[model samples]
Target chain A: YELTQPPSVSVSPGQTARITCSGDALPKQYAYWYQQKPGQAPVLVIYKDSERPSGIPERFSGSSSGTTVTLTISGVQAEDEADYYCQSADSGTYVVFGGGTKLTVLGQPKAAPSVTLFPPSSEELQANKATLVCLISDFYPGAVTVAWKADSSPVKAGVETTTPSKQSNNKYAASSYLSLTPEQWKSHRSYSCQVTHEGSTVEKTVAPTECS
Target chain B: VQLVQSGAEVKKPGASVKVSCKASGYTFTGYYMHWVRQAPGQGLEWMGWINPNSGGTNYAQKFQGRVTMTRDTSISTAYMELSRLRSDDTAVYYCARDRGYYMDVWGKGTTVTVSSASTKGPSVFPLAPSSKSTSGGTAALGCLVKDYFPEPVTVSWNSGALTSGVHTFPAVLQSSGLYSLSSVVTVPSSSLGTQTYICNVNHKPSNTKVDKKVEPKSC
Candidate 1:
């Protein structure tokens, strides 16, 4: 049996935090983390203990110090809930997890830097021709939907994307990409990827001029 | 922001498992749920999670999210429930804290079966050496040979004369039945713009050495 301590860390929206366990063990192979809420099953958060599950914020991370391990959080926000834990593969026989921690949200801020157009943001070569991408950075509440607007109307359906977790200023950061053809870019003249969550909406738009 | 995973009592398959995560914390308002799977012989399966708050969800395809992720921040926790529980679920369940785009913190996970276990053997990952500009006349280059088997391995700059400008030695991880070692040397900044640093991996049992190089990039 081993004892561990919860991580004492803080973060703002669009940032990250880490919970850690420092100790010496005979030696373990993999480590893991989990989340247990009142009425739900435990969710797996960390594994082998370093890589972040996709859609996760770069704000959250797991690392080790000899037998001691740590989980860090960046871009802290309101929705971070429940307790956090850690674990490692002890041997071929068993795996271990750390105790959990509870996150206290401070409330969403007035405005998260809205997603704006990226350079060469727009173009007009031909339909199904050139590709225009919309990107957004620094925000919390991973549950965001990206919608496309052509001219003033919403594009019926187009391929939208969310990238994997990345580290920024040692904080959590991620981007969403929406691609369209040069024709769509030229015709729409303007394209936007609107990210909506709760009562907040952040958008990134690309104009034809921006593309050319 | 937060995740509230689903709980299921499933029977074991030939070693199959099923797990899910729910959202909680902030608002489930922007972030999404990310699911991962771990087994005895594999890296994590970045299965996939749903952006309930956004009505959007993505999956690794290899690992499916046949489940649903819906946020009722009103309830204060997002929901991720699993159906089929296998020996695989025996690992651990975790909820990751996200900023709608990336993961920051992870919720403690739930362990399904207590049967199958991990190898818990020593593992090592070696990093390539790094190069940078140096004030000294000699360029410096470095390499990190971490968590490798057998300790007391001889590691030093090749020929002892630096040529890659500024360098950072590779980091080593010893103690986990593996050794974490790094080799670094200094070279003249004159060569900073055009030099490659190399990292050589030496294994004792096979008495073998493998080399890796680092390309020079603008600092």
Candidate 2:
């Protein structure tokens, strides 16, 4: 029995999160359910024949009939937005899982993050070192991509980007650093800090400047 | 600005194969080229990259001593060679631009299949047809093919009659280096009563063919 699932689902808080699991020629007894939060291994939510794992909330339940299996969360919470996958095993040892479904619990929409760029100072540049910092703050929902470009080309080497961290006000903050040679940061050269939030792109550029 | 990769390759075990990626629209030597590996129907594994100018190389510990990466400054091409192949080595390999440690631009992947014996044909399964409840009001059917070797397969519906709204995901690399692929087709709700959907999978390496069908049930 090969299991399959939807790519993803988005639901409002307190709503029912219904995830359907389908399979090819699967019997009813083969169905299983698992919940996987980001950066964590999958935990058994429901095991053999609709049995919930110990301490699992009653809100999470599983069912199967023929080739169709379902995992229903009666009250979806913010933390439930992690990925969910379905597993199925026939009589034999083989077990298969659906690709996985990312459940996004939508919150109130927020504005784009404000980004600032700080270039290397004169002393640092003279030592043939350069570091550019991209500071991102005032974002909500905490998902963004920060990219760096040197003179309009992608900067991959010596770059460090941080995952979004929640601020005190429950907003999001993130940053990235790009390091290069001082010769790579000469006046008349340009660098760009690009922030991607939601569906929009915000860019800030640093034009050539004298170290002295 | 981008990397262009070579085409697919099919080889026997114990033989060696090399794939190349040609860079264009950017200063190729100025940045590094990273090689990524995906076993049949699997996730990405970083195999490592080469310094195009200095010729230094770094490999992922998992792939150390098993893979070789090199580059040609004259042609702006980076090459990865996998030698003494086994069926476990079959995968789709990709090349990407490495800015520091991030991949910005990528090339289309090249598939390499290592098999000495006749490759295994896929187990084709026809899923139950589903109904799309949204505005389209169409019936959707999917075909899942599993446990295939030598990577590439051509899937068609209804004896070569190509239909619109058909979507096929790329074949996934399994841990065993076997391949699995799924394709879905949508037919209008009105046509469900009289139409029969057939999925034809042709695997060239094994010269194998599988045809699975599902007929529409009553509305």
Candidate 3:
């Protein structure tokens, strides 16, 4: 049989987070725990029979009874926001994994970022190159998406976006660049920059100032 | 924990086949056992898993009602049965022990191919791009292939060979058991306007071919 982990969870920095791993198999002692950070491989945290791996902190503990294994983090930290998985073995060779649980550390939920649109300069238009910039600032949680469009149609090419970087105030900022030729840019008429964060869509727009 | 699975089997559509995975070393009822499927030359897909001791199961939405999972604690064996199979059911199936969302150990996969002559080809079309802002020098677009049989299809763009930048996500299995594919590509923005991006889909089963193109407007 197999184990199941949650898809996501959120807890305060000082709060304790309890993530449970449940499966249909029996003899719960086989449950193992793992922690995975963004863009990194899963690291073994707890091994068979609730044993902690070397170098793991004392705050991280595992226990299993019946058909459920639980991983408890005494104090959730910013660095602890990651994915956790539970594993178990069957018979002699088969190992199964549960769907990972995403643990989110919430500080103070803030507003979505403010977005601004910058049109290309006259010199750039004269060179038959049109570059538009979408600036996003003051978003919390460091997760956002920037998208570009011409009129109502999606822009398919010449787009670049920056990873959300933390600001001094603990907010986040990022930008997206959209490129086009002066001729196509004029023909498309209106341009728009859309920023999405924290369940909100913020946008800014610019029209062709002059034809090159 | 260790898992040993059963041998491969060839069956026909409308028939059912049962595959077994035997556990050893670890407590047979301590953890769960999950199933996975991979078509020839395709990617891995999670099929649901079962608890050996409780006989409880949780399947992927696509496999619900079509697959049945069970176990025999006395024999330390878990079983998966697929009924009403179609030609697309041809795949290699494996059973593994579940680690939190990941499987660490796996059984040698068992192949099951539904022997049938009736199969349908897929249709290709453009999917509306997501309304997100992108940076200059890059463009993101995708296409969809629907109603395909046999599960696997070659998807590409602009008649150009598929490159590292091109990727196809897992095919979505419909209630009818037909398959649909969604693929996306990111190219230089400089390659946009004035060029027609054609989505090409080639399916072997029905010798079906579909070509859909996107022409960017001047603006």
Residue range B1-219, candidate 1, lDDT tens digits: 444455643343444444445454455555555554443222233444566556566554433544444455555455544544443444455556544333455555555543322222222222222222224344334443433544445443444444332222222322122334334445555554665555544565536566655444311
Query: In model 1, which runs have C-alpha deviations exceeding 4 angstroms?
Result: A1-104, A107-111, A119-128, A141-143, A163-172, A210-212, B1-219
After best superposition, candidate 3 residue A167: deviation in angstroms? 28
lDDT (10s digit) by residue, model 1, range A96-166: 34444444343444234334334121111321333333333344433345677777787745443433122
Candidate 3 residues lying further than 4 Å off, grouped into runs, are A1-5, A9-60, A63-212, B8-14, B22-118, B127-142, B161-169, B185-193, B217-219
State the lDDT of candidate 2 residue by residue for B79-157, as single tens digits.
Answer: 9998888877787787877654434466777889776644788866554455543487776665766568867888888
Question: Candidate 2 chain B: minimum summed lDDT over ten consecutive residues — where?
Answer: B37-46
Order candidates by lDDT, high to low. Answer: 3, 2, 1
* Between candidates 1 and 3, the lDDT winner: 3
**DockQ rank order:** 3, 1, 2
Q: Give all TM-scores, in the order shown.
A: 0.29, 0.39, 0.43
Q: How much is B124 displaced in model 1, in angstroms?
A: 33
Q: In terms of lDDT, which candidate is strongest? A: 3
Indicate the worst ten consecutive residues by lDDT in candidate 3 chain A. A88-97
* lDDT, candidate 3, B1-219, per-residue tens: 668878889787899999999999888887788887766433345788787778988887677899999999999999999999886788888887865444556777788977653489875545423322365456555565655787689887877764645645556444345666556665666666655677888998889987876444312
DockQ of each: 0.02, 0.01, 0.06
Q: Which number leads on TM-score?
A: 3
Model 3 lDDT tens row, A4-103: 7766566889799889988767373377776766433356678774778678887888887787888989887888877787766545245566777767
